[PDB]
Design an enzyme around this catalytic site. Structure first.
Site, PDB file in Angstrom:
ATOM      1  CG  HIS A   1      13.936  -7.593  -1.652  1.00 58.70           C
ATOM      2  ND1 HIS A   1      13.323  -8.751  -2.068  1.00 58.70           N
ATOM      3  CD2 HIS A   1      13.174  -7.108  -0.643  1.00 58.70           C
ATOM      4  CE1 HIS A   1      12.219  -8.940  -1.367  1.00 58.70           C
ATOM      5  NE2 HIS A   1      12.108  -7.960  -0.491  1.00 58.70           N
TER       6      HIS A   1
ATOM      7  CG  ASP B   1      11.425 -10.918  -5.095  1.00 56.25           C
ATOM      8  OD1 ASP B   1      11.988 -10.598  -6.143  1.00 56.25           O
ATOM      9  OD2 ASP B   1      11.966 -10.729  -4.029  1.00 56.25           O
TER      10      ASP B   1
ATOM     11  CG  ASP C   1      15.384 -10.234  -5.990  1.00 54.76           C
ATOM     12  OD1 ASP C   1      15.261 -11.466  -5.929  1.00 54.76           O
ATOM     13  OD2 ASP C   1      15.080  -9.479  -5.058  1.00 54.76           O
TER      14      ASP C   1
ATOM     15  CG  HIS D   1      19.882  -9.633   0.019  1.00 58.12           C
ATOM     16  ND1 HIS D   1      19.685  -8.315  -0.330  1.00 58.12           N
ATOM     17  CD2 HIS D   1      18.756 -10.300  -0.337  1.00 58.12           C
ATOM     18  CE1 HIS D   1      18.495  -8.198  -0.892  1.00 58.12           C
ATOM     19  NE2 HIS D   1      17.913  -9.388  -0.896  1.00 58.12           N
TER      20      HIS D   1
HETATM   21  K   LIG Z   1      17.226  -5.661  -7.558  1.00 61.82           K
HETATM   22 ZN   LIG Z   2      13.933 -10.287  -3.522  1.00 62.91          ZN
END
Ligand SMILES: [K+]
Ligand SMILES: [Zn+2]
Ligand SMILES: [K+]
Ligand SMILES: [Zn+2]
Lengths: 339, 342
Positions: B195, B282, B193, B158
Site C-alpha cells: 500500500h 503483504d 509495502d 499511513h
Molecule cells: K509502498
Molecule cells: Zn500494506
C-alpha cells in the site's frame, strides 16, 4: 389548507447500514415516517399531490454537478466492486483533500461526509423526487400561494454543496430558497430541527441574499459535531447573515421559545420577502434524538409564531424519528400555523 | 548479524473494531505478527533488544503536538462518553475542516482519517514504543552500524502529520528518516509495502533532503484510495523528489521486480547517504490484502537487490498479515539482504 407535495418514489429509499459513535446502528430515517406525515395531511384536509418534474437544473443551481453525477451513479459503480463490499455505498476513507477522485472509493471519500448517508439502489431516485417536492412547493408559493408543504423524505439540511450527510443527500430547503430567489430579492431560511443544518449554512455562507438562522442542540458531541457553534457568523459579504442559536443539552421548552424569540428578531431586521421553514419534529420530548423538552402543544405555538409572520412560506420536512407521535405533532404545528 | 529492536509493550495493542468497504471487519494487524517476526529474528541469530526511551521530541519532530496529545488522551475521553459509543475511539464524521474541535467527537473527525485506526486502551503505549524501536535502529545506524531492523508494530507509513490511518498511529519510517538527518545530508525512504505510504509522502512532500519512493498497488479502489498516483511528485523544492510506482491490480511477480528496478535507478540518481526501508510482507501472493504475485523466494530477491546498494540501512517493519508465512518470508528477505554485504 395548503398544497402538500409528496412523490411515492420517496418511499423506495430504505438502507440498512449506518455507522455512528463506534457501532453499526438501526436505521431511524425510514419510509414509515412519510406514511404518518401523509396521514396527518389527510386528517387536516390538505390536498396531497405528486410534484411535477422540474428537472436537474434547479438542483444544480445549489449543488456541484460532479456530486450529483456521483450520487446518480454510485450505487451502479459500487455494485461492480466485489460482492463483499455489500449493497450500499459508504465511505471508509475520510479525506476531502488531497484526493485524486479516481475510482468510486475515492469519490465516496469526498462526497459522503459521515457514516449516516449510505447510498442504496433507490436512494438517488428517492432523493431526486424529494427535491422535486421542495421545488413544487417553492413554485406554488413563488406564483402566489401564501404557503405550501414539501413532504421531503429523505431530508436535506445536512447536505453540503458537494457531499451527502446525516440521512441527507440533496438540500431540499436550500434548493427551495434558491428557486424563491428568482422572484424575491431577500429570502430567509429558518431551521428549527433538533440538529444544526450545516449543509444550508455552508451553501449560503458567503451570501447575504439568503439569511440562515438555526435553533439546535449544542453540537459538542452531538451531530453535526463540527459546526453549529454561535461564533459561525458567515464570511465575505455573508458576514452577519448566518445565525446559530444552540441550546444546552437537556433544555426546557421555555429555553426553545427564547431561541425562537432570537430568531424572530433576526428575521424582523433582515426583512425577508419569502421564508423557507426547515421543520423537524425531533425537538419532541420523546424523540430519541431530542435534547430539548418541546411538547405537542409547543409545536402549535411554534406554528402560530411563524404563521403570524404572514410571509410567503415554504415548509420543508426535515427530521423527527418518533413514529407514534409524528401525526399529532404535525397536526398541532399546522393547526397553529393556520389559526 | 543485525541489531533488531522490539519492545514488548508493542504487543499490548489489540483493537476489535475495523470498518471498511461497507462493513465491520476482522482485525488483521494483530499481536501474533510481532511474535512471528521476533522468532524469525532469533532463528537467524539476530540479537533482539529493547529500545531505550528516546522521549517524545523526535516523534514531535515529525508529528503535530495537537495530534500527539489527542492520541495519548482520546481513549480516556472516549470512555467518558455513553457505553453505547463503545471502548474504542473511531470517527463517524468525516470532516477535518472546517472543524471547531470542541468535544472528543470533533477531535476524532480531525485526527482519525479512516475506519482502520481505532484507538483502544493501549494503542498510545504500543505506538509510542513502536516508534522508539524505529529510533533505536536509526541511532545504531547513525552511530556506525551498517544496518539495523526496527521491528515496528503497530506499523507507521499511513500516519499523516495530524492523523492516524490504516492501522498506523505514528509514522515510524519518517521518524527514523528525520533522526538520520542529524548525521546524513541526504536520506532516502524506499517503501515496498503493498500500500502507498501516503503519510510518509505528506511529511516530506516539499523537501529535497529526504527522497520518497513507493512501490504499491494502483490506488484506484484500493487503500489509501485518494493518493499514490504517479503524477504526485512533490511541491516547491521537493518537485521531482517524490516518486510513486503503482502496479495494476493482479500484477505478476515480474511486474513487481520491474518496479524495483525503476526504484533503484531513482535511488542511484539521488545518491543517498543513508536508506530507510519500509518493508511490508503483504505483497506476498497469498496475503489477503495482496494485489501482486510475490513469492517467498521473491522476498529474497528483493533483499538481495536492496542489500547490494551497500548503504547504511534502517529496515522498518510496516504491514504483512498472513501469519503462517511471515517467518519464512522474513527469513528469505534477510537471507537475500546480507548476501552482497560486508
Ligand atoms: K509502498
Ligand atoms: Zn500494506
Ligand atoms: K436546526
Ligand atoms: Zn434533526
Amino acid at each position: 389548507s395548503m398544497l402538500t407535495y409528496f412523490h411515492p418514489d420517496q418511499s423506495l429509499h430504505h438502507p440498512r447500514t449506518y455507522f455512528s459513535r463506534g457501532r453499526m446502528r438501526m436505521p431511524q430515517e425510514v419510509p414509515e415516517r412519510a406514511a404518518r406525515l401523509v396521514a396527518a395531511a389527510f386528517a387536516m384536509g390538505f390536498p396531497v399531490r405528486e410534484p411535477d418534474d422540474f428537472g436537474i437544473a434547479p438542483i444544480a443551481a445549489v449543488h456541484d454537478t460532479h456530486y450529483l453525477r456521483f450520487l446518480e451513479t454510485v450505487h451502479r459503480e459500487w455494485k461492480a466492486m466485489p460482492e463483499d463490499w455489500g449493497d450500499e455505498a459508504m465511505s471508509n476513507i475520510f479525506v476531502r483533500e488531497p484526493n485524486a477522485l479516481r475510482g468510486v472509493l475515492a469519490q465516496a471519500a469526498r462526497h459522503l461526509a459521515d457514516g449516516s448517508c449510505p447510498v442504496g439502489e433507490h436512494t438517488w431516485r428517492a432523493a431526486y423526487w424529494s427535491a422535486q417536492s421542495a421545488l413544487a412547493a417553492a413554485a406554488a408559493v413563488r406564483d402566489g400561494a401564501p404557503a405550501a408543504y414539501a413532504l421531503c423524505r429523505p431530508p436535506g439540511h445536512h447536505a453540503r454543496v458537494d457531499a451527502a450527510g446525516g440521512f441527507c443527500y440533496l438540500n431540499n430547503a436550500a434548493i427551495a430558497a434558491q428557486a424563491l430567489r428568482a422572484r424575491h430579492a431577500r429570502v430567509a431560511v429558518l431551521d428549527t430541527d433538533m440538529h444544526h443544518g450545516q449543509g444550508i449554512q455552508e451553501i449560503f455562507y458567503a451570501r447575504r441574499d439568503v439569511l440562515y438562522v438555526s435553533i439546535h442542540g449544542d453540537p459538542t458531541n452531538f451531530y453535526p459535531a463540527v459546526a453549529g457553534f454561535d461564533d459561525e457568523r458567515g464570511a465575505g459579504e455573508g458576514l452577519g447573515y448566518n445565525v446559530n442559536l444552540p441550546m444546552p443539552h437537556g433544555s426546557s421548552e421555555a429555553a426553545f421559545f427564547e431561541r425562537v424569540d432570537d430568531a424572530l428578531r433576526e428575521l424582523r431586521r433582515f426583512a425577508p420577502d419569502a421564508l423557507v421553514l426547515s421543520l423537524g419534529f425531533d425537538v419532541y420530548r420523546d424523540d430519541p434524538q431530542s435534547q430539548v423538552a418541546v411538547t405537542t402543544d409547543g409545536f402549535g405555538r411554534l406554528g402560530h409564531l411563524i404563521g403570524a409572520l404572514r410571509l410567503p412560506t415554504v415548509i420543508v420536512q426535515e427530521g423527527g424519528y418518533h413514529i407514534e407521535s409524528l401525526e399529532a405533532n404535525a397536526r398541532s404545528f399546522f393547526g397553529g400555523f393556520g389559526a
